Write an enzyme that holds these catalytic residues in place. Structure first.
Site, PDB file in Angstrom:
ATOM      1  N   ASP A 169      -9.953  13.830   7.873  1.00 54.35           N
ATOM      2  CA  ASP A 169      -9.242  12.839   7.069  1.00 54.35           C
ATOM      3  C   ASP A 169      -9.037  13.346   5.636  1.00 54.35           C
ATOM      4  O   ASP A 169      -9.198  12.596   4.672  1.00 54.35           O
ATOM      5  CB  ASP A 169     -10.006  11.504   7.094  1.00 54.35           C
ATOM      6  N   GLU A 173      -5.927   6.652  -2.240  1.00 53.05           N
ATOM      7  CA  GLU A 173      -6.001   5.633  -1.206  1.00 53.05           C
ATOM      8  C   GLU A 173      -6.488   4.275  -1.712  1.00 53.05           C
ATOM      9  O   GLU A 173      -5.948   3.227  -1.336  1.00 53.05           O
ATOM     10  CB  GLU A 173      -6.906   6.126  -0.078  1.00 53.05           C
ATOM     11  N   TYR A 198      -3.923  14.514  -2.624  1.00 54.49           N
ATOM     12  CA  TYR A 198      -4.355  13.777  -1.453  1.00 54.49           C
ATOM     13  C   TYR A 198      -5.459  14.502  -0.698  1.00 54.49           C
ATOM     14  O   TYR A 198      -5.297  14.862   0.468  1.00 54.49           O
ATOM     15  CB  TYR A 198      -3.165  13.517  -0.535  1.00 54.49           C
ATOM     16  N   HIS A 251       0.853  -1.186   0.000  1.00 58.75           N
ATOM     17  CA  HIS A 251       0.000   0.000   0.000  1.00 58.75           C
ATOM     18  C   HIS A 251       0.888   1.234   0.000  1.00 58.75           C
ATOM     19  O   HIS A 251       0.688   2.154  -0.785  1.00 58.75           O
ATOM     20  CB  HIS A 251      -0.921  -0.027   1.240  1.00 58.75           C
ATOM     21  N   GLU A 252       1.877   1.260   0.878  1.00 61.73           N
ATOM     22  CA  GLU A 252       2.713   2.450   0.984  1.00 61.73           C
ATOM     23  C   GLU A 252       3.585   2.644  -0.273  1.00 61.73           C
ATOM     24  O   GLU A 252       3.675   3.757  -0.805  1.00 61.73           O
ATOM     25  CB  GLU A 252       3.573   2.421   2.252  1.00 61.73           C
ATOM     26  N   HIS A 285       1.819   4.220  -3.108  1.00 60.34           N
ATOM     27  CA  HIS A 285       1.694   5.689  -3.103  1.00 60.34           C
ATOM     28  C   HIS A 285       2.814   6.308  -3.928  1.00 60.34           C
ATOM     29  O   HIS A 285       2.606   7.294  -4.622  1.00 60.34           O
ATOM     30  CB  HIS A 285       1.719   6.265  -1.681  1.00 60.34           C
ATOM     31  N   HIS A 316      -9.521   8.056   3.477  1.00 62.28           N
ATOM     32  CA  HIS A 316      -9.503   6.640   3.895  1.00 62.28           C
ATOM     33  C   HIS A 316     -10.903   6.111   4.162  1.00 62.28           C
ATOM     34  O   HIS A 316     -11.074   4.956   4.563  1.00 62.28           O
ATOM     35  CB  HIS A 316      -8.683   6.432   5.170  1.00 62.28           C
TER      36      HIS A 316
END
Ligand SMILES: [Ca+2]
Ligand SMILES: [Ca+2]
Ligand SMILES: [Ca+2]
Ligand SMILES: [Ca+2]
Ligand SMILES: [Zn+2]
EC number: 3.4.24.27
Length: 316
Positions: free
Chosen positions: A226, A166, A157, A142-143, A146, A231
């Site tokens: 958020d 996301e 974002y 996931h990271e 990005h 998310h």
């Protein structure tokens, strides 16, 4: 560092043994020279300074509890690199074999992980909400994803573009988890979330509402928390992706699933060829439709299924 490529052995956060590519020069470093311009893992030593120190070990054995988050950040970065290269013919996150850097032991009891524009960063968790977060292959992927997004679509974002950003990370985090074929599922973070509670996770792609996230555009979050619910509203796109792959009925709309591999091809093409920094949900639908059209033809089942999936989550 300059040295020779070596192979060490250690244990990850979940206590599993694995070999890791290292580099020897006085010490054995967590530096894998076999992938692109290298994968480098660092010790942040419980500080918030980055990257910290390149991880050095005296004997090329990584079985200490302190070692475990590093072993997994390093190893799973490798698996993610392999996924993008073997599956999408993409060489690292920039497509030009950019060095991949990760730091572990970030801060004290830190319940998160992130891509910071330059590298991946992992907390150890507080032992209640999380255990060290690099223990999750979907989290690592996931990271790293990005980073791929940063170099391609550049999705801002915030609000809808951020929710797509996301979802893209959850989609490919999951496809990487399937690629490694170790207890794969459509949940996010289950391997590192709440050591005291069995069976839960941070987010679900198959049923976003299980964890409070919307699974239809009509239930989208419209406030400012958020970053405009990046998310949260990702559940709508995660659900669509899940449907494209697995099929099913959702709010009375039927979707013919086309499988993970095709999901991956369509979304990878969308991300790298059609999405822009300001793409909204409606524009993602179009990007995915066009991608599936390029790959399988306009009259194809794949195109039809993308349309039905977006219909099911109320995105036109
Ligand atoms: Ca050692
Ligand atoms: Ca899993
Ligand atoms: Ca998972
Ligand atoms: Ca749990
Ligand atoms: Zn993310």
């Amino acid at each position: 560092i300059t040295g020779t490529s070596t192979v060490g052995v250690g244990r990850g956060v979940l206590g599993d043994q694995k070999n890791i590519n290292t580099t020897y020069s006085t010490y054995y470093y967590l530096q894998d020279n076999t992938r692109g311009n290298g994968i480098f893992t660092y010790d942040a030593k419980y500080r918030t300074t980055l990257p910290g120190s390149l991880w050095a070990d005296a004997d090329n054995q990584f079985f200490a509890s302190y070692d475990a988050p590093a072993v997994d950040a390093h190893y799973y970065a490798g698996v993610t690199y392999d996924y993008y290269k073997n599956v999408h013919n993409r060489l690292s996150y920039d497509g030009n074999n950019a060095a991949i850097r990760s730091s572990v032991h970030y801060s004290q009891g830190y319940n998160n992980a992130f891509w910071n524009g330059s590298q991946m960063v992992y907390g150890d968790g507080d032992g209640q909400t999380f255990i060290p977060l690099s223990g999750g292959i979907d989290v690592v992927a996931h990271e790293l994803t990005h980073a791929v997004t940063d170099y391609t679509a550049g999705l801002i974002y915030q609000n809808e573009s951020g929710a797509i950003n996301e979802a893209i990370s959850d989609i490919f985090g999951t496809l990487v988890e399937f690629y490694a074929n170790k207890n794969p599922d459509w949940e996010i973070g289950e391997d590192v979330y709440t050591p005291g509670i069995s069976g839960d996770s941070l987010r679900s792609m198959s049923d976003p509402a299980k964890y409070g996230d919307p699974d239809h555009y009509s239930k989208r979050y419209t406030g400012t928390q958020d970053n405009g619910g990046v998310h949260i509203n990702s559940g709508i796109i995660n659900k669509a992706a899940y449907l494209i792959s697995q099929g099913g009925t959702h709010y009375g709309v039927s979707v013919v699933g086309i499988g993970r591999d095709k999901l991956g091809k369509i979304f990878y093409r969308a991300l790298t060829q059609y999405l822009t920094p300001t793409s909204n949900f409606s524009q993602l639908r179009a990007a995915a439709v066009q991608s599936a059209t390029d790959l399988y033809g306009s009259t194809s089942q794949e195109v039809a299924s993308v349309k039905q999936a977006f219909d099911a989550v109320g995105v036109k």
